[PDB]
Design a binder for this molecule. Structure first.
Ligand SMILES: NCCCC(=O)NC[C@H]1O[C@@H](n2c(C#CCOC[C@H]3O[C@@H](n4cnc5c(N)ncnc54)[C@H](O)[C@@H]3O)nc3c(N)ncnc32)[C@H](O)[C@@H]1O
Ligand SMILES: NCCCC(=O)NC[C@H]1O[C@@H](n2c(C#CCOC[C@H]3O[C@@H](n4cnc5c(N)ncnc54)[C@H](O)[C@@H]3O)nc3c(N)ncnc32)[C@H](O)[C@@H]1O
Ligand SMILES: NCCCC(=O)NC[C@H]1O[C@@H](n2c(C#CCOC[C@H]3O[C@@H](n4cnc5c(N)ncnc54)[C@H](O)[C@@H]3O)nc3c(N)ncnc32)[C@H](O)[C@@H]1O
Ligand SMILES: NCCCC(=O)NC[C@H]1O[C@@H](n2c(C#CCOC[C@H]3O[C@@H](n4cnc5c(N)ncnc54)[C@H](O)[C@@H]3O)nc3c(N)ncnc32)[C@H](O)[C@@H]1O
Lengths: 261, 261, 261, 261
């Protein structure tokens, strides 16, 4: 098939990429970075996120594979020593695909833009105080005051979400999880505190109270949005597809990354 | 239909029950506490849990309704002032049922018993230290040392689970959530810390390391089990069914109970 | 004595200030905003923090008093209805002073500046990733990766510190407390997690690892510092002095602000 | 001087004890377990706590030393390889003592008993629900509902207190810290949530609301108390004294135990 390989750009990753390209040259595999059907990421989870956003317009036609040249990643879960076995198995086909849910972010302005997240989307204030009204399925839920909010995909729950006290969710669950960043709670100000897990088709809307300018992040990309009227979150209808060649369960990846290896 | 009414047993609940029984007497409704098809709980969430465990062998043939005579409950979400409208609508039928997931607990002994939970099942030690091996789908995940563990249903996540730092999950998600009670973490002892959310068909097994005696709770019922070899958790194939007469969304119940009313 | 009155600037506060100024005019009290000995703050805790930083060069010669025109404050703990009794008692003297500890922040640059904090001093990164080496009394303690760090005074522990999970400390304890903002913890990255409480004369030093640019806040003031080589924290030798006219214990203020009133 | 040596009772500890006893036999050191002036603990922190409670009536006349034969302890902070250097230095004297604060627990009954804690004192319910009124210096602070409460010494803050989310406090601070175990917080029930740090002479009183029977722990000792009317906590006037032969700072012990070694 058509394939491409992205690299972290250091010496170890660039040369693994060149060696894998040489290995694919012994098969009916064409290097095409415009319309690939297999995207291999060599580096870390940051490199894998760049590869996902590089091709997020052809998610249904692409299967992703991640190789970690440093520590084990949650998306880059193949070792460099197995690049050869991977080259061959990818060329011989007969691999099954696995799909993870994604998060859709919609930003409406005053006087509309959509984004997909593989890890999470976060909202923070432009330096000053952060006050937003949280509306769930058109129902006003809370007035949040604090540092910000984070909405995570299932596979994203082991990332920022985990540091904010969120639960780890198996990626077979089509859901999104909202966590607070340093919420103020006293006699007059009140939030739920606990993380919130939302199913498919639930819409969470963040609406400004005073300042209309927010710092909005989608995975690694952080931008200042101005004249924002609403930020809408829902589980995407789209999915990211991985190529799977053997059993590496999610809970084993969790164990290997946080407990022991 | 056949119906029964359980009461908290205080003066307000007993007399609401007698008044509702009188109202049902004007319809084709027979009081039958052996094989009811409608079970009305009058009291609090504790009363509702007793009604659920009183009839957990006929869950598929029963629709539950809860009336709160004290504060608003998450299961007893009808006010006493609407008992009359409720009597009439229940008798005229034409109500839709909603279903919440349940948790199955299996306790195997040395030399097997199953339970259903509507809120959660918890495990603690018989006074001494609590050490269990946590195995997820036959994979050893962690050795837990601490006060205990709690496995919650979705509707249970606003109860003990919430106090232990777990996420609140919409009850349309068929899942279970595991939370830690005061886990020890140092150079030699290590747990994940974060709550864990498991989908249908995942099996979480707790296996003793030293002491084989544990205090096992299922909702309100707490018993000392001896010679335990394994405690198995999975989302039940069974569901509890509620009678619904108007829209009272889960996130609104969450708002009304924890934020404001 | 010489006194001055600062105001939040809204209608209620400005006119309470004018009425109190008229009341002081019936005593041997001179309005002097250059070298006052009594500083009265009318507004909220934000107004009181501005009054403290407005006169932090004469802390030993000033006793502070806060009046809250909105909700009860932890520093502005007098009601507007008692302004008259306060005018008279302040003029008749015979009040005792109470003193709270302060936090000294030192920022050293490449190729030195000091600040006092009444609530806390926080450090965040200039948008990118935040990595600092944490050194306690010249001993390398941890490499922190996350959103930032917060060092709180005792009276500051009910503010940002509380939202970050820190303990509430009685202000008679001469200490400072360090809390983490969303620290990453996995197989390769490790922090203590727990808040840390330091006694007098302990020095906590934050030293950059990669980026040398940080957003440093002292109470309400947040500035971007560039070419930073070190941020040093220690309990200040200076203290803020309050004028006390009756018993309003710290734990009662805590109760009134977070539990009920 | 007079000395004694307690042992964990395993093979490694018993024989280290016998070898140290032989080494002391070459000096003017008499083994006396009735009125020792030096108490050496060989084992873990549990062994050291037993040695402390074994001699808590002569705390002012005893200096403690802990040797860890397993992992590093916070009280047993000497390695077995340095037993010989320790034998000699203890016999030659010229060591300085360091003192850590202690926690006094008073249990009053219906129709009085005092305890000292080196780590903490905890209160839990006799199986049923735990409801106590929390009174600070005769002021009603909160009605606690949950699993229990823990009051920790400074050196105890790295133990149970840490697992409950409490702050780590340097042992030079004469204080005690109260942490909650799984408190319920909703519309009707309310606690502070945050850990609370109390100075010397502050008295925290726990008073029953319904059930008068509680499980009260002092360090490792857990007993069921009946007809309890009050549990009082305050920083003890007594102190535990350690023998110090070189610099091993508390924050380094924290680093070595929780971060890396
Ligand atoms: N030597 C670099 C040090 C800097 C570094 O923190 N780098 C990111 C770290 O995260 C891990 N990671 C990523 C990633 C990534 C790429 O950065 C962007 C993501 O930063 C996360 N992020 C941001 N601020 C965070 C915080 N305060 N705490 C925790 N994560 C935070 C967000 O979620 C972004 O989306 N995805 C997952 C995942 N799916 N599962 C578990 N681990 C994951 C990476 O292997 C790396 O260890
Ligand atoms: N005046 C009585 C004071 C005593 C009282 O705590 N009573 C239970 C409280 O819980 C609420 N509750 C229940 C219930 C119940 C019946 O008790 C058994 C349940 O105790 C929970 N439980 C046990 N220990 C807990 C703890 N430490 N913290 C929080 N909950 C805890 C477990 O989960 C049991 O299954 N279910 C839910 C729910 N689905 N959603 C939100 N709130 C819920 C009740 O209205 C009541 O406010
Ligand atoms: N309607 C305004 C909404 C905006 C507002 O959050 N305003 C500050 C709030 O705090 C209270 N406050 C202050 C203050 C202040 C003045 O702002 C600067 C302080 O913001 C704190 N701050 C910053 N980010 C925070 C966060 N994420 N969570 C909690 N606090 C946070 C820091 O600590 C600064 O130093 N000091 C204390 C105190 N000593 N004890 C208890 N409560 C305190 C104020 O009465 C007000 O409710
Ligand atoms: N292989 C045994 C496994 C069993 C074991 O947990 N054992 C106790 C563990 O603690 C450490 N420890 C002790 C101790 C002890 C002696 O037990 C009594 C103490 O258990 C603590 N304890 C009770 N339940 C706890 C919980 N859920 N989480 C954390 N600690 C808990 C209380 O605080 C008692 O007072 N003191 C300190 C200290 N000063 N600093 C840091 N670490 C400390 C010990 O080296 C050992 O690793």
């Amino acid at each position: 098939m058509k394939y491409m390989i992205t690299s972290k750009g250091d010496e170890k990753s660039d040369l693994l990429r060149l060696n894998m390209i040489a290995g694919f040259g012994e098969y009916d595999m064409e290097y095409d970075d415009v319309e690939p059907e297999i995207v291999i990421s060599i580096g870390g989870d940051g490199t894998f996120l760049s590869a996902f956003h590089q091709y997020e317009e052809r998610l249904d036609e692409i299967a992703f594979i991640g190789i970690h040249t440093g520590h084990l990643g949650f998306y880059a879960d193949w070792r460099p020593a197995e690049a050869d076995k991977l080259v061959k198995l990818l060329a011989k086909g007969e691999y099954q695909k696995v799909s993870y849910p994604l998060l859709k972010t919609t930003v409406k302005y005053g006087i509309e833009a959509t984004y997909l997240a593989l890890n999470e989307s976060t909202v923070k204030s432009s330096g000053g105080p952060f006050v937003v009204d949280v509306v769930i399925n058109d129902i006003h839920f809370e007035r949040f005051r604090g540092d910000g909010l984070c909405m995570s995909t299932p596979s994203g729950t082991t990332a920022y979400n985990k540091s904010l006290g969120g639960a780890l969710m198996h990626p077979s669950i089509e859901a999104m999880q909202l966590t607070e960043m340093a919420s103020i709670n006293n006699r007059v100000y009140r939030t739920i505190g606990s993380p919130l897990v939302f199913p498919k088709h639930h819409v969470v809307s963040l609406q400004p109270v005073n300042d209309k300018d927010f710092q909005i992040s989608v995975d690694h990309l952080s931008i200042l949005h101005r004249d924002v009227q609403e930020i809408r979150y829902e589980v995407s209808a789209k999915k990211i597809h991985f190529a799977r060649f053997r059993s590496f369960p999610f809970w084993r990846r969790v164990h290997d990354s946080f407990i022991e290896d």
